Amino acid sequence: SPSFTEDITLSAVMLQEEDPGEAATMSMYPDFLKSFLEHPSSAVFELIEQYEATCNTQITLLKKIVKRVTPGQQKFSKTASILWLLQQEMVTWRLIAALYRDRIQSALEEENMFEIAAPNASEKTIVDKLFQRDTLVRQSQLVVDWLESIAKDEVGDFSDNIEYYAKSVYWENTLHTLKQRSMLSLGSSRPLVSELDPDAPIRQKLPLDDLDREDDIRLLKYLFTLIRAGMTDEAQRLCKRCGQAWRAATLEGWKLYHDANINGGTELQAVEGNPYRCVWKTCCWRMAEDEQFNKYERAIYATLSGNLKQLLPVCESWEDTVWAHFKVMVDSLVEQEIRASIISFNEANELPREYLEANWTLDSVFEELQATDKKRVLEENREHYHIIQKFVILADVDGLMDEFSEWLSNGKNLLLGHLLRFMTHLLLFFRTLGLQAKEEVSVEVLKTYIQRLINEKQIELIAFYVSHLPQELAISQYAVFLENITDPDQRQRCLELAKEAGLDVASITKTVVENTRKKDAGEFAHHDFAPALDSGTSEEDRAKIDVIDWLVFDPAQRAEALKQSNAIMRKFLASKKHEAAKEVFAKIPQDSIAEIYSQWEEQAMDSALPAEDDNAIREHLCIRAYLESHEAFNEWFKHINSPPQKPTLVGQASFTEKVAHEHKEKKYEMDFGIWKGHLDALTSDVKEKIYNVLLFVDGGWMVDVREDTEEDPERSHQMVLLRRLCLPMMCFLLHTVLHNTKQYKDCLRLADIVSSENQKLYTVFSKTEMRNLLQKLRES
């Protein structure tokens, strides 16, 4: 497959590094999401096979890395250990997938369990009945198939590998030495068998040669392993290699007997073995009670008997001990319903009473496993994968959630990104099974996992996984994400990915806005001049400036964007950052109000138009007017302060100097005319806008239809504050301008006209201020 070529080639292109595991870890997730694309969420099993296949390819990738590591470097010992944990999670995949597919089949078939009959035909009828009827033995069979599938995957081509282990001379050393004793002048002083019997020595007590017995022990490893795995084809292979056809015969004492040639010609349906097998296992049982065995024969036949004490010596692994638990209990059960189904209650076999009457359950599996006083099993028991998979068998949801709780209490360093993803798939298939775990633990795991995921960024990854959250949390986290998305290319890309995979970005942008509003706020004062010793830009100021971009990116957010922008314009001015206000005004389009009006028109619906959009229009316009009058007054002030030139006043001079004076006077004429025209135009425009902002809406300011304290009491407070602040000096500046333009008659009528309680404009002047205006009217 291309997957293996990619594994080796990227192992080459990746080994330069020292942490390839996480790189591959992230490389996995795009495949996750693509697969979610091609196949539905009811196909979780095929999802699991693709999981296992791809993660196996990555297994191979890490194998290639670790083997391409030179000797004397444990820098990739970590890589190998992670690769180990990878195989552990893989076998966890196998375990859960098979376990709960069996669970599903059971749930499908719940209503017809267990049977009854009497012997009427060949005992294979007994056998397949027994296999079909019970559940407990069924899942025991499946977990055994699991472990031994593991074993055979480990095995592979041991066939071709034994091509180079071979010797086919029976006890060759004893052969040659007895030959030379018979053959020479001098024999040997050394005792040996006269017999080739597999029991020739021990029956005769006679010695055998070390090379003989130890190549024996070597083949004992070979086939011992092969049958601890049950690799039976290779078993007869090795038998017929080394000429232990006797031993291969010994292998057959347990496999039962059948034939079905009740049909057709005399043809082979089954000829297999000797039906003396129940008693023959009893015989092996008593041979075990007799002991005196090599490790291999001891283990194999104590196994064929399920004899616990003589099976103790060889199995010491966690896998071996649970394996043996299942083997023993499956045997005891299976023989129990053998004797039950085959009609008999008399003596045909002998076993100890406790063996006969020991009860069997899946609880006993793990109770035995736990009670193992062997420290290898004890330390293996505390290993995470073991705990995980045994909870998989037990469905101990409370224990699992508590154990996850101590995991997260330890944090996320023990729960790497791939561990978090794996517990995530855990919960995923729980849910697709309609099984629900504990939700706060789930969200804790997922938030830590997404913390990982954002450490590895990649906008394409985030949205679906975030889509799994309580709404407030998901909003907050996509906010934290997209606020870093600041370059419009990947920005818009993130928006399309978000609208594809959930959690719309618009509500996100708003939420950023009100969270920003909640942290920080600006000054408010309706008394003259903002209090400060020194003033400048603040972090809060810049944050309020730069939260705006998230709203302004989306053309559809213009209404609320304008509303909050005008509010923050208010904060600008009340915090004495009119420069911030003008910069934001330059940032925002001048046609936004018209664009929003046209958009609300274009929907062919204007009835649901509340006061609010049109209000936003008024604020935008009122800020525009106030600021514009501000710089208009400043422009007139700077222009008047810039005279063209003073008249030439030099006395008696030369004729050329007189020509220069004439040129100076002509220049004075042009400059004075131009400057005075501009000055008077500016003066007229300034007073025009002064009236406009002084005679706007009955002489009101910042006024708006909805000042509801149910909506925002602080809005009304700010708005009345704004009027009480800006009105006084605006009127006084008008008085000064009119007085300078000798419009004292306008000062007297304008000074007497400053009471508009129609739109909150008659209670903004103060006692000292009204005294000051009294003296202004007095100067006029």
């Binding site: 010793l533 420069e579 501000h630 400043n634 002030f637």
Partner: protein
């Protein structure tokens, strides 16, 4: 090979790496500069340790010798180039200290202007980086005063001016309004009469663009104090806390002359400032008169 092997012990004690660099004297670039120069610059940047390398001033006096001084000559050029690369990387304080070692006050004073001008523009708060920069700048100034070290007299006078400005703002922020007042008229930038406006004009063209910016805040604090004075006097009548009315009226008349002169100058300045500053100028001065 060389640079990788240097990586083997970059954070080791300084002179050790120095002999490694010493082998690189023969090596350089025909396309620009020397690998020797670049590496010594980068590694001394990583080091931030100098008293052994270039040596150190006892306090500000003669430079005690450095380690490279034994095997190398003309190390002032290296000082300048290294601090140049430092400021290129924005390493302003340490580059300035290195030119303090170099005895080159020009860039030192320029950069301390760019350093103080922003921090001077904030309130006086204890334990502030404003105070840190103030402290290093005043150390520089005192050293040069004691040493008679003289830059271009324009910069020298502007810097002493600035120092007096910080004195002013410290008084303002502590609320010692009278002390700040005394400071400003001895700073003689107070146009009490209209005839001082063109003097302030003459003072302006002496200024660089940065202080031209900061004049706005200066005049802001100015009008703040002025308005406080006038309002306090107005609130003090002849039957409340003394301060007879005649003296208050005469002083307020003089102050109004000052304020109107202030606004005249603020309008007849030659370069554009903030319109917000202009409007606030006018509106506090109307409050004044």
């Amino acid at each position: 090979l060389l640079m990788l092997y240097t990586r083997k012990f970059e954070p080791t004690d300084p002179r050790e790496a120095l002999q490694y660099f010493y082998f690189l004297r023969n090596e350089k670039d025909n396309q620009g500069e020397s690998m020797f120069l670049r590496c010594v610059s980068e590694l001394v940047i990583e080091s931030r340790e100098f008293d052994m390398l270039l040596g150190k001033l006892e306090k500000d006096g003669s430079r005690k010798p450095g380690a490279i001084d034994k095997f190398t000559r003309d190390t002032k050029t290296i000082i300048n180039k290294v601090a140049s690369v430092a400021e290129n990387k924005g390493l302003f304080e340490e580059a300035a200290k290195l030119y303090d070692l170099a005895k080159n006050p020009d860039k030192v004073l320029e950069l301390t202007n760019k350093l103080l001008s922003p921090v001077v523009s904030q309130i006086s708060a204890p334990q502030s980086n404003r105070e840190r920069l103030k402290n290093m700048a005043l150390a520089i100034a005192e050293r040069y005063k004691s040493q008679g070290v003289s830059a271009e007299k324009s910069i020298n006078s502007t810097f002493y001016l600035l120092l007096d400005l910080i004195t002013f703002f410290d008084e303002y922020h502590a609320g010692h309004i009278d002390l700040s007042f005394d400071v400003i008229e001895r700073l003689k930038l107070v146009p009490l009469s209209q005839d001082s406006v063109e003097e302030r004009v003459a003072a302006f063209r002496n200024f660089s663009d940065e202080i031209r910016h900061n004049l706005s805040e200066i005049l802001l604090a100015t009008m703040n104090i002025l308005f406080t004075q006038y309002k306090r006097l107005k609130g003090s009548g002849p039957t409340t806390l003394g301060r007879p009315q005649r003296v208050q009226e005469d002083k307020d008349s003089v102050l109004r002359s000052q304020a109107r002169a202030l606004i005249t100058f603020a309008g007849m300045i030659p370069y554009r400032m903030s319109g917000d500053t202009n409007a606030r100028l006018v509106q506090m001065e109307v409050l004044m008169n």
